[PDB]
Design a protein around this ligand. Structure first.
Ligand SMILES: O=C(O)CNC(CO)(CO)CO
Ligand SMILES: [K+]
Ligand SMILES: [K+]
Length: 539
């Protein structure tokens, strides 16, 4: 049958299907297009989704949430340890592997984070099956771009337990871009900033999209910032107001705080579309009815630090991506909290008036992209890789960047690394990695007869030329004598598939921090040696 796209989120999960040329976000039993990522254990039954969240106050100890925070992690991690403080459910050490302890049918039961996530995936699969009328096995599950291999594997394992065959694990920012069809946009290297403000998590990702290939240049955000924090500021304000107006603290009564929180959540939604919102609660504390109103401006004032702090991760992502704000070509809003007008104004003003892509429901965009990717996997002139030469230390120095329109001619000047160097070896490589060993060797040629001189004085000009056919000609000239040597590298049709380019870009993303340190180690950027570093029998 048709494959489904699943957004497994920390607070909420969404499932979508591409059928008859259209993506449909599938509603649950209660008519909700988003299902809470909550699993509840009771003396008689196991509850998943909205039902679990509705009874959380009654059974906090046995209601589980924020499993995505523990997936593919270790009990020792500071994140795990810090998070446990705010969780009513028990997290226990099992040989350093985090597991949740709950009471189920009178037996204490412990479950892995992937097991809890599998139960959420089971509900999403069931929601899809009820809508489709057919069993759904194939699925594409999304993960945060910063997730490591163990977290991604743990997510795939959760689907495997659920009975789903996970065709691919894809980044949530990449899924949002696919939903907006940024990949299908014409041209070269569009830079995309995904601004994701969920209920409990904030993510900012910069992606460069070129010829259908996505590269995650940078990631930034706050794992503990979301819409709930905005609700908390409103709740604290109203508790203070009641204490001033009626001289009572309602914080003692759990039900009173819960009723106020629900009113604050409804008011925040109203404030997204209206200037003011009304709070009406009967007998909130000691029989006193609380009837009051809040303006959008007061809501903005209560959350001013949180709203403006959103720009700081955007600034860090731009610095890590080494891009100016002007170089961003597309901005995508993901998450319900992005509906807030102040957040949109702060981002648009920071980007000097740039339009924001908000057209697809922010809560459903990641699932929408996952569904398009699932369909593509199921039935449903530019340069592919960076081209460069090896510099001293086996470093890759790029002369032609990936996705550069062809024909192109690029020239750089290099020097000897050793005193009285007789010659230089020009080694041509293809790849996105800092070291040539991690890149592909295309050809090598030798320039010799260099006049004896101190290191840094001989000048060797290397030129890369691509005739429109795509044939690469690499030439080196000794500037002192005019002596030259060149290699012609044939472009075989089908040498690289789309997957081959994707794997090498994904490898560069996985090792970006380590790759940067290797670039920092060599003092001179363009010094050339007379030997292949990869074939040296040292270290
Ligand atoms: O909360 C998260 O896990 C990430 N946020 C999204 C919800 O899953 C996914 O991108 C969208 O807000
Ligand atoms: K997801
Ligand atoms: K997020």
């Amino acid at each position: 049958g048709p494959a489904v796209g699943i957004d497994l989120g920390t607070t909420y999960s969404c499932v979508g299907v591409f059928q008859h040329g259209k993506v449909e976000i599938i509603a649950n039993d209660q008519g909700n297009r988003t299902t809470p990522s909550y699993v509840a254990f009771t003396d008689t039954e196991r509850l998943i989704g909205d039902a679990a969240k509705n009874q959380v106050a009654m059974n906090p100890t046995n209601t589980v949430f924020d499993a995505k925070r523990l997936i593919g992690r270790r009990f020792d991690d500071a994140v795990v340890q810090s998070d446990m403080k705010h969780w009513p459910f028990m997290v226990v050490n099992d040989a350093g592997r985090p597991k949740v302890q709950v009471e189920y049918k009178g037996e204490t039961k412990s479950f892995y984070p992937e097991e809890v996530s599998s139960m959420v995936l089971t509900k999403m699969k069931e929601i899809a099956e009820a809508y489709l009328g057919k069993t759904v096995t194939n699925a594409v599950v999304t993960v945060p771009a910063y997730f490591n291999d163990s977290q991604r594997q743990a997510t795939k394992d959760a689907g495997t337990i659920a009975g789903l065959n996970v065709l691919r694990i894809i980044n949530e920012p990449t899924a949002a871009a696919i939903a907006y069809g940024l990949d299908k946009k014409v041209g070269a290297e569009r830079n995309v900033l995904i601004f994701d403000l969920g209920g409990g998590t904030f993510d900012v990702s910069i992606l460069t999209i070129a010829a259908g290939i996505f590269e995650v240049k940078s990631t930034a955000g706050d794992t503990h910032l979301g819409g709930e924090d905005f609700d908390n500021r409103m709740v604290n304000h109203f508790i203070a107001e009641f204490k001033r107006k009626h001289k009572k603290d309602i914080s003692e009564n759990k039900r009173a705080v819960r009723r106020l929180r629900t009113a604050c959540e409804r008011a925040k939604r109203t404030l997204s579309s209206s200037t003011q919102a009304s709070i009406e609660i009967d007998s909130l504390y000691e029989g006193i009815d609380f009837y009051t109103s809040i303006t959008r401006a007061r809501f903005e004032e209560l959350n001013a630090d949180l709203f403006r702090g959103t720009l700081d991760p955007v600034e860090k992502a731009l610095r890590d991506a080494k891009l100016d704000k002007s170089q961003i070509h597309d901005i995508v809003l993901v998450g319900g909290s992005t509906r807030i007008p102040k957040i949109q104004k702060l981002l648009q003003d920071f980007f000097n008036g740039k339009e924001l892509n908000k057209s697809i429901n922010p809560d459903e965009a990641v699932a929408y992209g996952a569904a398009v990717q699932a369909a593509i996997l199921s039935g449903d002139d530019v340069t592919p890789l960076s081209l460069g030469i090896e510099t001293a230390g086996g470093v890759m120095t790029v002369l032609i960047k990936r996705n550069t329109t062809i024909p192109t001619k690029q020239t750089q000047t290099f020097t000897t690394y050793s005193d009285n160097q007789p010659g230089v070896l020009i080694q041509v490589y293809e790849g996105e990695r800092a070291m040539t060993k991690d890149n592909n060797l295309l050809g090598k040629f030798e320039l010799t007869g260099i006049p004896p001189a101190p290191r840094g004085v001989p000048q060797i000009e290397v030129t890369f030329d691509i005739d429109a056919n795509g044939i690469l000609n690499v030439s080196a000239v000794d500037k002192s004598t005019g002596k030259e040597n060149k290699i012609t590298i044939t472009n075989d049709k089908g040498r690289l598939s789309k997957e081959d380019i994707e794997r090498m870009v994904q490898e560069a993303e996985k090792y970006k921090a380590e790759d940067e340190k290797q670039r920092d180690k060599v003092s001179s950027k363009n010094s050339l040696e007379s030997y292949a570093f990869n074939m040296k029998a040292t270290v």
